[PDB]
Symmetry: C4
Subunit: 365 residues, 4 copies
């Protein structure tokens, strides 16, 4: 597996163009694993086109200058209201793998989410973070003791929150991966105890993780870890009520980048109903489709506290390693700064109160 | 000479849409387009497909679900999954084993075979393929009353446990591909010569002046439950039940009949609300994915019926190819059940759907 | 101007395909004059896509067989609920011009509408009609005596209604014709007196038409008057108050005001306002039997056919044009059977399914 | 900074304004052409500006007793030949060698108002020569220094400005991908704002960056008080800003999204107009811009609450193709296009336009 190895900053004009650029340096199978989604990818398109449903207003004479992008979540002060989404197997994108992404995220000044399906060990990632804050995303074992062990190792590494990804009890129908017969070209050291991953398909990896996740799992992870728990993959408001009742300390609105259930809504369309149900009882992280500063703003305006970034950071990693990934984070901060100035937002809380224009015509207008 | 493919093999289905173009490589041009095509410029066939994006499924989490059960029961038949085979004539356009091949797939899978009155096979040939599997017979009514009595008696003696009255084909749809290819039927219809006849003249020999009395007459004569097939307007569901139907079969004939009509799935909720659980509902016209099976049940259907994708599987692999399509739908549905929080088929019928007012382009 | 000249029936699978086929035989300028519309033709596309806003239901066990397409309008018995729209310069499509269309229309058994801008004389058209019914479409002159004279000649020819086309007081912005520098290759003998049109552009007649003109035409001719080009219901009220005997809903095939609605979308509001006081003719975008049915279900009494008939005339002279009329009758017969309509009055009562998603569904 | 704008002067036959874009691309240098034509992001909001016109459709009306429609109107005491004015646009020398004096001559001779951008590549004296006494409004991009604003406003008023336009939607630049990809810089100076920067060799983000970011309602008040001229506030898309501007002493509201050159993933400008017009409630005049390309658009804007529209890109493309005569051709095209529309809609005069029923099209562009 010939992963890219260039380390360089990149001049990001927009994040969309990074996809085709990365396609020229990432091996075909791996690239399509990263870029692809379920079915014919209509719901991935829906994640993107959802942003045109609610439109931002420019606002004038707002007495605003030098907008402050910084915010705080679960005690962590971060440079902008976005974090790194949990993504396994960064080694598909770049030889420096999760340690590269970790270096970008910590240097930038936000929170790194570590996937249980990382191709790097806790020690390797921690070397890249150099003290930076991190949250750990568990894919649950069937065996309780193994979940206890993974959680203890995560916390001992320094995790300050646990993310339970519950929308992948089985694999999505990822036609690119089926057609390419994709299999991992390396191991997953954190979950190996219950599988190695090298040569396995993702459907069999998700297959070893727990299918019968219930609200008791949320309660049990919360009690065992003593850390705030996010429940990730929520698209229906009832699950936010369920998660909060079961002791969750945050809601993570996501459709897994459209890699899971097909013929489902664009994730952004689901956010307002979820935020209304949550009603600020706990923090909300939003993901699945964020590509612009305007998207960050619209998410916050619609009830998110922060967003999580995925594919664009991974494409940045492919093209330039840690410096490429950092270039993408920096882009988002600068992009957001512009949008804050033009929308009349002095600070992150102002973003959360913006009026949005309803566009009933959709993408073709 | 019509020379259909004859190879029997399993196929690895990634999705059923790709089966269309794959099947086009092995089926004679004329026959293929007869199967694939629809009325006018096929806008309503596209509508059947795009309607699925009007109501979107939610993923649901921590639902305490594992190993979802796809089994269900309809009019006392226990079936492996909530889909049956739609009645389609002339399977011989797809594969040399014709309706017997589809029958074997359906029977071995474990669902119900619907036999078209316009099958290219006899009841005896189809029965060999079914090897005892359940079957329903779909009638295209004759003008002559005794002929209807005779066909129904033969169907029932063959083992039919329900009758399907297809009433949306009193004349043929405007099927441009068949006109432009100058296609005509290459073999007979022995249950009802058909060979060398256009479909429009075939439908011409059947009864045009179908009335509610016909539903009453078929039910009384056969002593079997009768489904009325082709329904798109809720008043017809009411009429059919009042006339003695034991089931409603929501369909636009795969968009092969009236043009510039709705996508079938968009018609389902108003029909199910009108039926008000009085009789079972079968839904068809455009089902291609497990997501579609789930959305139809969530919208008031009890089962769906499959058509073109199974024929395309038959073309590619005979009974084994058709079986592969049925298996694909069962596994596809299983995934969807797991991700939506559905442990069983009754759970599918209760799912919330997300309304998408933006339609296909979003 | 090398117009098509051959005469033969044609196979019509659908009318949309006639446009491309006609383009291969009609001279470029004249073809594009017939086919084109204002601006970038968005409103011509809207005329077409409007049919997907309201969708037909198949209906079952309706006790229907051998549907009857026939109807009557102002006492004329016609074979199907469609007439020929008034279109000038049929010579652009075929050497036999309006006499060819007239033969098709009379042989079929409907009403011929004669444009004041016809390339043929009344006598030439009359020999094609062989006694068949005709209505005369006037484009008003500024001079009152010229209007009197034209109406007298039309009535003398046998017109049994007058159609006042009032949506062309100035020309639409027809980019194809501007880009092609289109000019008529022949004269317009009926309106000669006030212009010869050979060498003239269409944009080069009365602009200040008022309701009084409707009154004066009705009073002078003693014939029923249709007011043609209506898209707003207030104009239906105005026209009926002014003595009109019919309302002709139309946007001139999208050749007039640009960035306006598709004609079918305007029909229900106009039919509501008319409230059955007078008959309604609908045009602009009819291409299928389904469209005929939908127009009737939405308040029209008949529709008028235009471009597809002209494309048929290009392809086959009167027999070509006849094939198109026959196509529409057969197409409607299928639709009637499948929708549960025994007769034309049943079409007028059909439920339609609302499609809020539009063309891409 | 090599830059070779076209120089030929000729009338042009305008069939429609859309076609002028491709035609101008043949003769305007690449960077400057794409600076004029382009917009933010992937230009979805520029497309929205254009497709918004299909949301509300015109009715033809019959037997209206209308002939020879009169396009003349009046705004803040200026009698103009048609209900459109020239939008403020800097650096006209990117389009044609004759620069802002070329456009000024066309606008003046046609008989409407010239809006002069603070970022003009021409001095007041050079523009005034082109105007030959014609009416002018001055568009300020504010300095941070109060005295420099007073000086600019004084010079503008001395030159003959009869209104001041505060463009407040560009406190920082939009994300203009074409200009980033092309590394666009201005090839000449901006004499009116040089005092706070020159612009030659500078990127627009750094010129906007020198202008005032922290614009507040007090700036509107101070401009109005200092100049003693009516002040428009330009770039409004949200009705609250119309309330704000009037409360602060504005004499007019200029609805605009800057040609989609500023905030991305925002509504098409025409879609915002009715809510603004409802809030304004005829307290002050409304200028509308961003996407006007046809007489139908002028009509629809007036029917939806605007008093006049402002023209931008199509006039610059005309300038590129023919200098002042090319620009004149574009203005004339608009007057004739509007006249046709007025005849067919039953509109005898500009006030009738403002009263037109519109057909609501909930299907949008694809219908
Ligand atoms: C390649 C790749 C791999 C993974 C993911 C995504 C992608 C793209 N996602 C989902 C991820 O956290 C996030 O929800 C999406 O990346 C957001 O969608 P976009 O990146 O904005 O398109 C994911 N989520 C998770 O909780 N654990 C994981 O290991 C992975 N793996
Ligand atoms: C080739 C072919 C032939 C037939 C049909 C369909 C097709 C595709 N259909 C309609 C069929 O029962 C069912 O309604 C459609 O197949 C459903 O549409 P899809 O297959 O999902 O597109 C049909 N229906 C019926 O009742 N008797 C018949 O003989 C046939 N024949
Ligand atoms: C080439 C051409 C020429 C004319 C027209 C149309 C066309 C296409 N139309 C309008 C005509 O009566 C009718 O309203 C349209 O043809 C209907 O649109 P479709 O033909 O269905 O697209 C027209 N109308 C009229 O009253 N007098 C005329 O002379 C003409 N001329
Ligand atoms: C090349 C160019 C340059 C500028 C502008 C636009 C364009 C296209 N615009 C905005 C302008 O006044 C107006 O809002 C838009 O031109 C209207 O959009 P359309 O031209 O119809 O697309 C602008 N606005 C302003 O107040 N001062 C300026 O200097 C400029 N500069």
């Amino acid at each position: 597996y010939n992963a890219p190895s260039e380390i360089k900053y990149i001049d990001v004009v927009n994040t969309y163009d990074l996809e085709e650029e990365a396609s020229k340096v990432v091996p075909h199978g791996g690239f399509n694993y990263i870029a692809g989604a379920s079915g014919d990818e209509w719901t991935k398109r829906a994640n993107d086109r959802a942003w045109k449903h609610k439109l931002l207003y420019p606002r004038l004479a707002q007495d605003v200058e030098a907008p402050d992008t910084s915010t705080e979540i679960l005690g962590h002060k971060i440079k902008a209201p976005f974090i790194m989404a949990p993504i396994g197997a960064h080694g598909l994108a770049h030889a420096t793998k999760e340690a590269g992404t970790a270096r970008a995220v910590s240097e930038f000044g936000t929170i790194m989410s570590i996937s249980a399906y990382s191709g790097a060990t806790f020690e390797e990632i921690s070397e890249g973070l150099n003290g930076g804050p991190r949250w750990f995303q568990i894919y649950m074992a069937k065996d309780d003791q193994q979940n206890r062990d993974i959680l203890d190792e995560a916390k001992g590494d320094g995790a300050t929150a646990i993310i339970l990804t519950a929308d992948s009890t089985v694999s999505g129908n990822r036609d690119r991966d089926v057609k390419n017969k994709f299999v991992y070209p390396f191991g997953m050291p954190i979950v190996q105890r219950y599988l190695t991953a090298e040569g396995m398909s993702l459907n069999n990896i998700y297959g070893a993780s727990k299918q019968k996740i219930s609200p008791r799992d949320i309660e049990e992870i919360a009690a065992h870890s003593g850390l705030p728990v996010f429940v990730k993959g929520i698209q229906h408001p009832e699950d936010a009520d369920m998660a909060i009742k079961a002791g969750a300390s945050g809601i993570w609105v996501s459709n897994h980048g459209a890699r899971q259930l097909y013929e489902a809504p664009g994730s952004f369309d689901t956010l307002p109903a979820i935020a209304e149900r949550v009603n600020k009882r706990v923090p909300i992280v939003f993901d699945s489709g964020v590509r612009r500063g305007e998207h960050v703003a619209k998410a916050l305006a619609s009830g998110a506290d922060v967003v999580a970034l995925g594919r664009p950071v991974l494409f940045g990693l492919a093209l330039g390693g840690w410096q490429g990934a950092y270039s993408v984070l920096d882009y988002f901060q600068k992009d957001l700064t512009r949008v804050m100035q033009l929308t009349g937002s002095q600070n992150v809380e102002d973003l959360k109160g913006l009026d949005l224009f309803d566009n009933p015509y959709g993408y073709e207008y």
